Structures are given as C-alpha cells and as structure tokens.
C-alpha cells in the first residue's frame, strides 16, 4: 500500500503516486513484477531494485503525441 508506507517520506510518496499511477491498483497498492530470471531470488532482487530506483528517482511516439496535441489546441482555439 503506497499511501500507508511510512518508510517512504511524504513528498517522494505523492511523487511516486503521480509518476507510477500506471502501476497502482484500485485498492491503493503499488504492484511490481519481475520475470527476467528462472530464480525467484533474482526476481525478488530485481523487484527490490525497482523499488529502490523508484524511491531515489523521486528523491532526485512522443513526437506524434505532441503534434496531435498541438493540432488539438489548433482546433481548441475558439472562444465564446
């Protein structure tokens, strides 16, 4: 559960919420996966490294979407 994770500081916690809301379930817990090995030891190590990298990042196609959004603004331009 991301919000009730007291080992994570507050500002980094809402930063992780707004950054990895793609990985937040409806009950409010972060879910992280690893499949890169046939050893569950190494899979768990990868999951913990994902948690650690995610926390330290909080502590610290795109062209297509940009052009489509600019054209959407060009259609948006009309005032009342």
């Amino acid at each position: 559960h991301l919000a009730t994770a007291e080992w994570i500081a507050e500002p980094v916690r809402q930063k992780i919420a707004i950054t990895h809301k793609n990985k937040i379930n409806r009950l409010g817990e972060l879910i992280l996966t690893s499949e890169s090995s046939r050893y569950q030891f190494r899979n768990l190590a990868d999951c913990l490294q994902k948690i650690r990298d995610m926390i330290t990042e909080a502590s610290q196609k795109l062209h297509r979407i940009r052009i489509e959004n600019m054209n959407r603004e060009r259609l948006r331009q009309k005032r009342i």
Binding site: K21, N25, R38, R72, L75, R76, K78, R79
Partner: protein
C-alpha cells in the same frame, strides 16, 4: 506452344503502319495520366487491385437519407457568374493576384462549404472511417443537417466534434452543447454511440446517449432515455470511434424497449446495436446528421472505470507473433553460435545432473 489472349491487348488499337504520323506523349505527366486511367481500367489478367483491393459487393449501397434539396441551376449559374465578373471588375483583385498577395476568407468558405458540398464530403469520410459498414451494415446516407457540437471545457473554452478529431474524455466528461438549424414542429432524436470499446462483444457497441423526441433547436427539453456516460477506451486498446447520430422524426415515437434506467452504469444494459434500432424504428425516422470523433485512454477514463462503473480497469497491450525460426538441424553447416542462441530458451547457465 501459344495461347491466344482472352481479351484485347493493351497497345493493340494503336496503328503501327508508320510511327512518325501519330501524336506523341512529350510529357511524363501525360503518360502518367494515361497510365493511371489504364490502371483503373478493369483488365482480364491478374491485378494488384484484384489481390489487394477491397472486394465489396456490387449491391449499390442503399440511400436511407433525406431527399436532396432542389436548386434552380439556371439562376444559380447566373448569380455565380455575376459574382465572377464583379470580382474580375474590381481592379485591385488583378493587382493582388499578379503581385501574389491575395487571400481568401476561410470562415465564409467553410460556412458555405457546409451549405453546398460539405454533406457529400462528410458522407465520404464516414465511409472511409467505416460507420456505414459497422454502424449501418453497408447502407449509406448523405448527412443533410449540420450537427454542430462542442464540449464546454474551462469557462470560455469549447472542444468540438466535427467529423473525426481526437477528443480526450477529460474534455468529454460532461454533456456537449449541440446546435443544428431547424424549423418549428419537426421532431428529432440524437444518439451517441461508441463503436469500438465493447470489452466483451466483438460485434456490439456501447450506447452513451439516447436523447429522444426533440422539439427543435432546443436540446435541453427532450426525453433523457439514457444519461450521458463519458467515453471509456481501455488503456493500450488503441483509438476508438464515437458517433453522434441525428434523426429527423415526423411523428412521436414511444421509446420504452430502449429506455435505459435512472443512472444506468451497467455495460450489459448499455449494450446497443444501431442496426437493430433502425430496423425496429425504420418507418419512423430518417438520419440527417452525423458527427463522429476519436478518443484515447486518460486519467479521466481511469476515474470513470474505478469510481463510476465500479470496475477494475482492464489493461491491454499490443503484442506481436513470435519470429519464424525454422526447424533446428543437428549440423547447422554454415550457421553461427547465434543460430544456437536463436534456439536457446534461457539465458542463464544450466548444469544438468551436476
């Protein structure tokens, strides 16, 4: 051994007697036009059009539209011409055209384009997007009523639905403002339907709005037979189509078998088929307006799935078929250690019985 041709040869009607008399393509453009016409010609041999083009049935797709408006061609061409020579009599028009500094009013151009030729272009684009194939099973109609729809966002801002732009469901959360020019005493029905977006049925679609029995231009006084649900395209499911359908109704029609309840937040109850709707109600209304748009997943769509629809949000992703990799030989004669890597499963070392 020879076989005679099954039809006329291509360069057969050209006379080969003396080649110096015949007129000639001196231009690649002229040859390109002639070759494109010959490519569009049917032909009796095998053709890229035969193997790749869409084989639609020659059913001469039926018109279920309104009859076209009648115009007097003689006075129409008279007024068009007199506009032409008054503009050609204005002296500064020549100066602007020759100095290449002239311009054109796009708002007036677009308004009377909607007046004159906009319905046929809108019908063509609807056929390209495939609503007449999906929503109406092949049948076509020319949309003869301009269905201007915009979405109230911000406090001064409008997100429109003309004929297929991208509108995010953040902008499509609330009910859009609709106007279409009309006269008193004529009834209407407006419909919003999401064609792509049915999470279970690959054939059916979703009804998002079924406003019925509209007195006129006023769209706030009709029967709300289904509340507006904002579009919810699933994440990674691609770009979905939503259609506004406007129907001219002559008589009042009871809508009791198609009356969605007080707030209806069930996808099974919101399942719809416009084909069955128009089949049941065919002798009652005739479609006259059509305005569609496209939508993608958003944080709004997450909100609509989670709190409104009481749903766990489905996640889809686009995955490719696995590569070919032919049957593995015992002696890969001139292949590499990369061939062995191709047929390997796991990248980690194995030790067998040890």
């Amino acid at each position: 051994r020879r076989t005679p041709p099954l039809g006329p040869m291509p360069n057969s009607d050209i006379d080969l007697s003396n080649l110096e008399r015949l007129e000639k393509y001196r231009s690649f453009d002229r040859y390109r036009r002639r070759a494109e016409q010959e490519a569009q010609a049917p032909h009796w041999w095998r053709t890229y059009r035969e193997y790749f083009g869409e084989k639609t049935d020659p059913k001469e797709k039926i018109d279920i539209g309104l009859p076209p408006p009648k115009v007097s061609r003689t006075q129409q061409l008279l007024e068009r011409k007199q506009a032409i020579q008054e503009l050609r009599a204005n002296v500064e028009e020549e100066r602007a055209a020759r100095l290449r500094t002239a311009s054109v009013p796009l708002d007036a151009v677009r308004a009377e384009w909607e007046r004159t030729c906009g319905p046929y272009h809108k019908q063509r684009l609807a056929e390209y997007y495939g609503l007449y194939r999906d929503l109406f099973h092949g049948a076509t109609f020319v949309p003869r009523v301009p269905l201007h729809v915009a979405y109230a966002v911000g406090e001064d801002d409008l997100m429109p639905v003309y004929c297929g732009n991208e509108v995010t469901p953040t902008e499509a959360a609330q009910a859009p403002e609709v106007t279409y020019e009309a006269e008193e005493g004529s009834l209407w029905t407006l419909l919003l339907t999401s064609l792509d977006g049915h999470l279970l049925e690959p054939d059916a679609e979703y009804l998002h709005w079924l406003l019925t029995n509209i007195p006129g231009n006023r769209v706030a006084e009709g029967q709300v037979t289904c509340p507006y649900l904002p579009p919810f395209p699933a994440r990674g499911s691609g770009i979905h189509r939503l259609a506004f359908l406007l129907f001219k109704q002559d008589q009042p029609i009871d809508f009791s078998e198609d009356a969605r309840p007080s707030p209806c937040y069930q996808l099974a109850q919101r399942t719809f088929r416009t084909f069955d709707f128009y089949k049941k109600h065919q002798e009652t209304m005739t479609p006259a307006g059509l305005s569609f748009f496209q939508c993608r997943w958003d944080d709004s769509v997450t909100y609509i799935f989670h709190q409104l629809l009481d749903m766990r949000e489905p996640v889809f992703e686009f995955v490719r078929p696995p590569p070919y990799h032919p049957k593995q030989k015992r002696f890969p004669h001139r292949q590499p250690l990369r061939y062995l890597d191709r047929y390997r499963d796991s990248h980690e070392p194995t030790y067998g019985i040890y």
